[PDB]
Amino acid sequence: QPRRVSFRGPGYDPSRPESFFQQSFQRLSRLGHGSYGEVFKVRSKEDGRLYAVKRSMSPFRGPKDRARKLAEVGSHEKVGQHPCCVRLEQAWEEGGILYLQTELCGPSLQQHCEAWGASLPEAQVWGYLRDTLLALAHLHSQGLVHLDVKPANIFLGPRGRCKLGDFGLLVELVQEGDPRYMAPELLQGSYGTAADVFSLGLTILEVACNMELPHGGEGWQQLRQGYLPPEFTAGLSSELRSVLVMMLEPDPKLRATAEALLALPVLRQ
Ligand SMILES: Cc1ccc(O)cc1-c1c(N)c(=O)[nH]c2cc(Cl)cnc12
Ligand SMILES: [Cl-]
Numbered sequence: 001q002p003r004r005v006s007f008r009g010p011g012y013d014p015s016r017p018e019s020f021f022q023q024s025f026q027r028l029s030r031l032g033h034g035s036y037g038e039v040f041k042v043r044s045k046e047d048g049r050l051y052a053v054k055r056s057m058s059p060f061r062g063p064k065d066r067a068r069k070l071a072e073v074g075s076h077e078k079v080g081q082h083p084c085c086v087r088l089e090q091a092w093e094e095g096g097i098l099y100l101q102t103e104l105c106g107p108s109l110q111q112h113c114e115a116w117g118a119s120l121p122e123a124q125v126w127g128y129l130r131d132t133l134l135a136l137a138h139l140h141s142q143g144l145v146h147l148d149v150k151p152a153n154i155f156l157g158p159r160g161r162c163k164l165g166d167f168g169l170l171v172e173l174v175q176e177g178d179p180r181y182m183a184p185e186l187l188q189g190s191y192g193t194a195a196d197v198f199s200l201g202l203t204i205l206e207v208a209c210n211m212e213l214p215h216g217g218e219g220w221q222q223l224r225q226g227y228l229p230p231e232f233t234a235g236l237s238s239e240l241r242s243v244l245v246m247m248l249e250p251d252p253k254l255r256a257t258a259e260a261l262l263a264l265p266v267l268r269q
Pocket of ligand 1: 031032033039052053054086100101102103104105106155165166167
């Protein structure tokens with residue numbers, strides 16, 4: 001039977017063998033898949049509304065495997081309702097499989113940039129920067145660190161808005177993060193809310209310049225200093241180059257916070 005998963009303290013007939021997910025949802029399309037599992041766009045058979053549902057691939061190996069997957073629901077609940085964060089509707093487990101039902105969002109910022117095959121227009125980038133900064137400011141005011149800010153985890157909303165999602169790595173002040181967007185202080189085992197600001201800086205640098213970020217090597221080292229590659233950052237404006245330099249400050253003690261960036265004249269919007 002389905003077990004509701006939470007940390008805040010009709011249609012389904014258990015008589016027949018199909019799982020609750022097959023029984024209560026219309027599989028419209030698969031939005032993504034991987035080692036984690038699958039994500040589907042669904043239409044709920046109870047209200048007709050559209051949602052996105054992510055399910056794990058294989059049953060729980062053990063208690064640690066279960067608590068690891070279930071922690072995403074807890075991390076998602078600690079964030080709470082915010083306009084710039086993907087809203088979790090409900091989560092449950094059945095047959096050792098964990099299901100997460102959220103609101104339906106547009107394509108990810110990674111998909112959006114790949115579809116255009118070029119640098120996003122700078123007015124479009126400022127909106128994505130501000131919206132994700134607002135999301136990080138919401139997380140960081142609660143002592144939460146996302147630790148996986150990247151274009152694949154930023155999802156478009158209507159009229160040029162975007163929302164921050166995938167809170168599976170979120171920690172309250174750790175697993176392996178993406179090295180392309182990793183803040184330098186994480187190498188020494190030092191984490192804080194400043195790590196998300198750096199990852200957002202590399203995220204904006206990727207989408208505004210259409211450059212692939214290095215997984216390692218010297219190019220990875222150069223981005224963790226104060227050095228922007230003049231080959232790719234040539235097209236940026238003065239205001240945008242100024243903001244990225246502050247977000248990419250190597251010293252987390254000196255790196256600007258999300259609240260500080262949002263108070264700047266260009267981002268005060
Ligand atoms: C289902 C889900 C759960 C948690 C989360 O943090 C985000 C999503 C998600 C959405 N809410 C969405 O609209 N599209 C997606 C596309 C992919 Cl490939 C992956 N996850 C999602
Ligand atoms: Cl390296």
